[PDB]
């Protein structure tokens, strides 16, 4: 089955562009000494809460690029598929991934992050479940509550962003600019989640959906690219 | 003539990479008057000259980057269209590229000199006022950078066209970042001026890597 092929190709890189890139940010955490402390070996999945969705584009567009500019995507195009049927295939392999980053939000990562500062003896993130009905008297913790419910939803939007401008503007270009555009739309989540939190907290009179807007502006762009050119 | 062919075009892309770089560092500082003013006690309507005439904190740091990466990008366009190797296979040697790089570096090293001495205290003494040994010697190893990276980027402009442009210009941008980050860690630290040889090793690498095909074994 070739629906078990595009999904295998994306899942080949989305681990490979993750393990290279988390451990790139793992080896930069030899800053606490500035020697037997495995503090960076113990706080690996704390980055994967946030250092994952910018790799959910660079990697869903890196690896899908070498599926497309080898003149292959325009063969499945010309052999019966629709443009929607290939869009259904990345969402067939997004559901083993949005659940995988849902797991580290409750089970894995804050369990070790609880004992992160405790092991190195000589936004108050706890979970989704325990943080629910923790903020009963609102505030900034109500925002980072509501930011953390559908922070895993952004990974499913991300592979729809990566597939958006692989059919539109960016297809007849060399492999180098697929990483720079594949990282400049990934770097921009730093400068977007870290302002529109404090924007809505200060100015935004709808104080609840201030975190939905970064994962909303990368959906208006995706609906413009595949519904205007053709 | 052929020197005029380069410097009318690298300066046509010097300014284009300048304004996209002067704008990308406002949105890492204008964040820090909203993401830090609610967190680290900085007032609100002082930003009009704090972000306005705070630019020599950053414009002393991007003119050696914009002259470097302006020249690197416009040689990558010049190799991959094979316009170098009809010019290289005529009589003129590699020295036309190196002689051109110094001329376009004067138009930056003058700007990096006037900024670092005259437009510095125009904000540090006429805008540091509110209106509402510890020597640094970092200003000489920043003017000297401008006549140094341009001397070594013209041999590091190959594109080897089976590999792409962005991978070809990877060991240049990544080698500039190594040089331009020792020179902050060796500014905060305390054997100061021992970093002058760090300035001199990559000047010797600027000579070693520039002539590496004219010489025999």
């Amino acid at each position: 089955v070739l629906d078990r092929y595009i999904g295998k190709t994306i899942f080949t890189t989305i681990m490979m562009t993750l393990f290279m890139l988390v451990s790139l940010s793992g080896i930069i955490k030899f800053v606490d000494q500035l020697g037997a402390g495995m503090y960076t070996l113990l706080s690996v999945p704390k980055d994967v809460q946030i250092f994952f969705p910018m790799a959910a584009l660079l990697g869903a567009l890196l690896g899908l690029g070498m599926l497309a500019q080898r003149s292959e995507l325009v063969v499945m195009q010309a052999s019966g598929f629709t443009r929607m049927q290939v869009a259904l295939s990345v969402m067939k392999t997004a559901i083993p991934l949005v659940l995988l980053t849902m797991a580290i939000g409750e089970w894995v990562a804050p369990q070790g992050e609880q004992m992160a500062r405790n092991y190195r003896a000589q936004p108050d993130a706890l979970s989704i479940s325990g943080l629910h009905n923790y903020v009963k008297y609102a505030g900034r913790y109500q925002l980072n509550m509501w930011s953390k419910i559908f922070q895993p939803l952004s990974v499913a939007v991300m592979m729809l962003m990566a597939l958006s401008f692989i059919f539109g503007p960016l297809r007849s270009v060399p492999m180098g600019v697929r990483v720079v555009t594949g990282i400049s739309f990934g770097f921009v989540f730093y400068v977007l989640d870290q302002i529109f939190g404090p924007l809505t907290l200060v100015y935004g009179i709808p104080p609840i959906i201030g975190a939905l807007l970064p994962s909303a502006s990368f959906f208006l762009i995706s609906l413009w690219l595949l519904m205007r050119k053709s | 003539i052929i020197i005029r062919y380069l410097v009318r075009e690298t300066l046509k892309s010097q300014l284009a990479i300048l304004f996209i770089l002067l704008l990308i560092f406002f949105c890492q500082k204008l964040v820090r008057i909203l993401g830090a003013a609610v967190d680290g006690d900085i007032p609100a309507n002082l930003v009009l000259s704090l972000l306005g005439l705070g630019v020599p904190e950053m414009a002393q740091l991007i003119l050696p980057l914009s002259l470097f990466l302006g020249l690197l990008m416009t040689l990558g366009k010049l190799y991959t269209e094979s316009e170098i190797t009809v010019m290289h296979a005529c009589g003129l040697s590699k020295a036309v590229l190196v002689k051109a790089a110094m001329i376009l570096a004067v138009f930056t090293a003058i700007v990096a000199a006037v900024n670092v001495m005259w437009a510095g205290p125009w904000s540090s003494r006429h805008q540091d006022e509110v209106l509402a040994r510890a020597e640094l010697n970092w200003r000489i190893t920043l003017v000297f950078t401008v006549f140094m990276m341009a001397l070594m980027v013209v041999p590091l402009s190959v594109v080897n066209p089976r590999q792409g442009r962005v991978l070809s210009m990877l060991p240049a941008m990544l080698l500039y970042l190594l040089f331009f980050l020792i020179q902050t860690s060796l500014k905060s630290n305390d054997p100061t001026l021992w970093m002058w040889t760090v300035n001199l090793i990559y000047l010797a690498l600027a000579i070693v890597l520039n002539l590496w095909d004219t010489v025999p074994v």
Binding site: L24, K29, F30 | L170, P171, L177, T184, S188
Partner: peptide
């Protein structure tokens, strides 16, 4: 590629990547 070009961008990048952590 080359025998050295896939060996410079590993070592020299690692010297960049550890050096960010000195002044982080």
């Amino acid at each position: 590629m080359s025998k050295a070009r896939r060996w410079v961008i590993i070592v020299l990048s690692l010297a960049v990547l550890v050096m960010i952590g000195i002044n982080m």
